[PDB]
Design a binder for this molecule. Structure first.
Ligand SMILES: COc1ccc(N(C(=O)Nc2c(C)cccc2C)c2cc(Nc3ccc(N4CCN(C)CC4)cc3)ncn2)c(OC)c1
Length: 318
C-alpha cells in the first residue's frame, strides 16, 4: 500500500523502474504505478524523467495514457496513470498475428488522433513504435512512453537524435536537424506497416545493415496488402521529409475513409484542429469524504498532481 493505493500486481520491470497494478482505495479505480529509484538515476536521466512527466501532464486525450498523480520521496518517484487492461500491442501480435485491415484501420485511426493532438499541443513523440502501444479493455489504443518526446515550435528544427532504429526516419540516422512532425509521420508509416504485415519494412542482422535499408527507402508490399493501404504507407515512408503526407492529409486518405463511418474520429481530429470547468458535485463529493474544498481548489489551481488532484480527476473520468 502506497498512500491511497493498494498494489496488487507487477506488470513491468525495466530501466530503473518497476510498474505495478494498484487500486485507488477511495475511488476504486485501477491504476498503473511506475516506481523509479532515484538512487539508480544519473543526472541527465533525472532531467529526462522530469521532462517526460511535464509532457504527460499536457496530454489529456482518449487515446493517450492519462497521468493522475505524482508522488515523490527522497529516494523514490511514483507515477500513477490510467490502466490499460488490454496490455501491449506486442502481446496481441504474438497471440494473433498480423491484423486484418479492418482491425488495423480502427487502431491506426486512434493512433493518428492521439499523435495529431500531440502536434496540436506542440508536442512531438519521436519514438512511436507498434509494440509499446497500450490497449484498453476493448482493445482501444492508448499511446504511452513519452520518454523521447519534446516541445517543438512549428518550423523550428530539432537536434536530438532519438528513438528506435526500425522506426527512425532516415534524416535521424544521417544526424541531420529535423522537422519534429515529419519524424513522427515516418514512424507512423512503419507502425502502420507492422500492424497490417506483422513484420518490419526495414530490418537487418546488424544496425549497419538496417541503416542502409532505411536510407534506401525500399520495402516489400506483401500480396495481402490492399492498394489503398500500400498507397498510404508509401506516402508516409518517403525519404524527403517535405514529400511526406501531413497529418491533415493522412486523416483524409481513402484508406481511412473506406469502411464503417466514424463520428468520434472526425470529432477528435476536429478538436485537435481548433485554435481557441469545475465540477461542483465532484468537489462536494470530495468534501463529504473529508477533503477540504479549499485545499482541493489549491491543488487544482497549482496543477499539483497530488492526492486531491488525483481524486478530482479520477471522479470526473467516471
Ligand atoms: C509491458 O511493459 C510495460 C509495463 C507497464 C507499462 N505501463 C506503464 O509503464 N505506464 C506508465 C506508467 C505507469 C507511468 C509512467 C509512464 C507510463 C508509460 C502501463 C501498462 C498498462 N497496461 C498493461 C498491462 C499489462 C501488460 N502486460 C501484461 C502481459 N504481459 C505478460 C506483461 C505486460 C502491459 C501493459 N497500463 C498502464 N501503464 C508499460 O507501458 C508501455 C509497459
Amino acid at each position: 500500500r502506497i498512500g491511497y493505493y493498494e498494489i496488487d500486481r507487477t506488470i513491468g520491470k525495466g530501466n530503473f523502474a518497476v510498474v505495478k497494478r494498484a487500486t485507488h482505495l477511495v475511488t476504486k479505480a485501477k491504476v498503473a504505478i511506475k516506481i523509479i529509484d532515484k538512487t539508480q538515476l544519473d543526472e541527465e536521466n533525472l532531467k529526462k524523467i522530469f521532462r517526460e512527466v511535464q509532457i504527460m501532464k499536457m496530454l489529456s486525450h482518449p487515446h493517450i495514457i492519462r497521468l493522475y498523480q505524482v508522488m515523490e520521496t527522497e529516494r523514490m518517484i511514483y507515477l500513477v496513470t490510467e490502466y490499460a487492461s488490454g496490455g501491449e500491442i506486442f502481446d496481441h501480435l504474438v497471440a494473433h498475428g498480423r491484423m486484418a485491415e479492418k482491425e488495423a484501420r480502427r487502431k491506426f485511426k486512434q493512433i493518428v488522433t492521439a499523435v495529431y493532438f500531440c502536434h496540436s499541443r506542440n508536442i512531438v513523440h519521436r519514438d512511436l513504435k507498434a509494440e509499446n502501444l497500450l490497449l484498453d479493455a476493448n482493445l482501444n489504443i492508448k499511446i504511452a512512453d513519452f520518454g523521447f518526446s519534446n516541445l517543438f515550435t512549428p518550423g523550428q528544427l530539432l537536434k536530438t537524435w532519438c528513438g528506435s532504429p526500425p522506426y527512425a526516419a532516415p534524416e535521424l540516422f544521417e544526424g541531420k536537424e529535423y522537422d519534429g512532425p515529419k519524424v513522427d509521420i515516418w514512424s507512423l508509416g512503419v507502425v502502420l506497416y507492422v500492424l497490417v504485415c506483422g513484420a518490419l519494412p526495414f530490418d537487418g542482422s546488424t544496425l549497419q545493415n538496417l541503416r542502409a535499408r532505411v536510407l534506401s527507402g525500399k520495402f516489400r508490399i506483401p500480396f495481402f496488402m490492399s492498394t489503398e493501404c500500400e498507397h498510404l504507407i508509401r506516402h508516409m515512408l518517403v525519404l524527403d521529409p517535405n514529400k511526406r503526407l501531413s497529418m491533415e492529409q493522412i486523416c483524409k486518405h481513402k484508406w481511412m475513409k473506406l469502411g464503417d463511418a466514424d463520428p468520434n474520429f472526425d470529432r477528435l481530429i476536429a478538436e485537435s484542429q481548433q485554435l481557441k470547468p469545475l465540477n461542483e458535485d465532484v468537489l462536494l463529493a470530495m468534501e463529504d469524504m473529508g477533503l477540504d474544498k479549499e485545499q482541493t481548489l489549491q491543488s487544482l489551481r497549482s496543477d499539483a498532481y497530488d492526492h486531491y488532484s488525483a481524486i478530482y480527476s479520477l471522479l470526473c473520468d467516471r
